[model samples]
Target: GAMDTFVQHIKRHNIVLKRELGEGAFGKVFLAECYNLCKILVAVKTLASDNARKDFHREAELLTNLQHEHIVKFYGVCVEGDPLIMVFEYMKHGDLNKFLRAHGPDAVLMANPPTELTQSQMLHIAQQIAAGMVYLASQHFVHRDLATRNCLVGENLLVKIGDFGMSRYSTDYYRVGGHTMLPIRWMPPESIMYRKFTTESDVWSLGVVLWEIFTYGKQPWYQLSNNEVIECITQGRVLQRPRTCPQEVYELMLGCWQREPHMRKNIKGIHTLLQNLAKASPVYLDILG
Candidate 1:
């Protein structure tokens, strides 16, 4: 009876599943064709267990209210079939991690490796990511998992923040961590050790994401074991700048990696810095346009 009701609700939306895009522990994402009013391609993330239905709905609601140029657009939600699904704008280039690693030595395992992107293009992507984070910070939302994999790249290398399951609204400066798995390589010292997450902690993750961008998708702290990563981070060891990274950009990364939470720059500051750098670069505007 409940399944029939849910199926009716989904049928009312007139979205047809096209193909599977990706899958994770939470759910599988599929490419879909929306036939309501106009034809458009969209992504549908589906979670198929009663135990996770509430969490699925919660993430959908969070994404629905978050609208920014650098944030994926939420179309609607469907609770039909056995799983609940959330629809979103489709990105052409897929996730940033795969996009960046789609070329060079680190991309050997990729089936269809993309051509190498210029440093200017990479900077533009970083700028957009900063802009998205700026909007999120303004809304007092903390994305516990801010990494390359959590961002999507579209036309013109436009980077947009995606995946809201680990994100939450928090006006408070600090949030207590739950038992959820954390992205250790992307976390700051405070977040890893004290289980404290905040906008500042997200900034730390931004730096790691930048590192991934500059290095063309290399894994963070690859040489270090989990225990070593914990030990190294707690001991105040910040990642060395990638060879391809500009000095100014690397300095910005260092700022985000500051040991003291209060010492880190705000999202606005990071956005501004990136904007300025992009403006000064000769090829930045050309690539972005």
Candidate 2:
């Protein structure tokens, strides 16, 4: 039975939990060192409640089969009982959104300014995210919660899209269940109105993510409350370009934010557009830096 597959014990791993990395409804993620694997560092997400453990086990099952350079690597899971833990590769720079916030326009200036990311570097970040989405799209996966906060940055500033507990594999759209919690700022009109999630809706969220990158982690529609954001998006209101956003980049964002789901750009198309922009980096070097 499939139930038999979910009861693996963790006694063999010899993982030493070092510290808490982050925490949320799912559970707390800790930085751990695995003595069985040459003392390698790993990120361990430990689900605190029985219900959370069941959900974490389901997500771990899906993640164990996923592999991509632009996706966080899942090592394994221990689902024997309480405090079920899922292991993943440690992301050195942490989540992209928080990383940007610490170095964003509003961040207080320190003695050593963070290295200015070049136009090419910024585009690469977008490109990698799109590339990861392209893979997920091909697999018929819908990442309902696609946001900068869900992505992680690793070596060489590589960005990988993650946080898949809200993700599901379906033909086109997945209807919301009672436990689902949507991110209003990143959701599209259809998603907010009907609780429908699709890859196209993910594209809309990707556009919001691009906005985050350009604005350096500024919240989408900074002045609007969540309810106000819902009202604005439902009325076809679109985000204006950030002060330093280049024309081409903003146009790409607009393409993804199209009100009609069919009209929204696909992940592959967005990836291609970013690749081209990456090749034409000189025009926006000063503006982006």
Candidate 3:
């Protein structure tokens, strides 16, 4: 199938398809190695249809301009006309979703697989997330969807946040238009009731992110639907961290899930608290580069 299309577009860009890496709304990701480059491996995302071509292009444009360690490096964009293509540096470890699904060292890790994730691991992911968030926040860019699914896990469990399809700038907020909602348990109370999502709203989402880190990415509410989730979250029933969770980390999680939107700590606070909570070199910053 790919060979058939190869004949149509005579451009000889060195691409060697290896295996399927992931699947998503736009299309599938393939683990590829550049035939021309000796030690280079890349991940290629091929969109399924021409309808969402502009959306892919828009995301590519936004990512291409941002150069941050915590953000996935955008290799380039390939416009095959019909099937839009975007290439990115391959994260050998894959995304956080897969990592979380694994059953620890016994069932997950091959050699020294994470037993429960050291404080360093959590702090590392948190810092990288914070770094990417700071950049977006400073520029008034909101990554409407910032779930663990969108986060990339790299060497030694470092974090790199990506996926900007649902991203929007402050100026484009209304122009991009309308509002539906998100998984309520993962969203703040204000955002679930009223469609108001500001930087503060994003902060609330980060609270969910912290919860994800604490729970090893379990679905916000095991089997709760969107409506039930909404009702619970709207009534101030948010994620309650487990006793097994680290004390300082648990406190931070509670701070993030605070009922009063205004009283909730901002990303800046998250960054600082995480720093104070962990005593080692922030692991998130190590992989950010």
User: Which residue pairs overlap in candidate 1's backbone?
Assistant: none
Predicted candidate 2 versus true structure: per-residue lDDT over 77-99, tens digit per residue: 76655666677889988888777
Model 2 local distance difference test score: 0.76
Q: Stretches of candidate 2 above 4 Å error?
A: 1-13, 23-26, 48-54, 108-111, 165-180, 282-289
Candidate 3 residue-wise lDDT, 1-289, digit = tens: 2222221121226766689886544357788776543347888777555547667666666666666778887777667554566678888777785675562333444553445554567666777787788877776877766777778887776678888535212111222124543545556777666766667777777878877776667767766655566678778776777534777777777777777778877787788767665546454433221
lDDT of 1: 0.76
Candidate 2 residue pairs that clash: none
The residue-by-residue lDDT of candidate 1 on 1-289, one tens digit each, is 1221221124535888898885443257889987762488888776556657877676665666778899987776777666566778899878787788775454544534445667877788889999999999988998888888788888866789987545322111123344546688888889888778899999999999889989988888988777787778889998988989999899999999999999997889899999887766635343211
* Rank by lDDT (best first): 1, 2, 3
> Which portions of model 1 miss their true places by more than 4 Å?
1-13, 23-26, 48-51, 105-114, 167-179, 282-289
- Candidate 1 vs candidate 3, TM-score winner: 1
lDDT winner, 2 or 3: 2
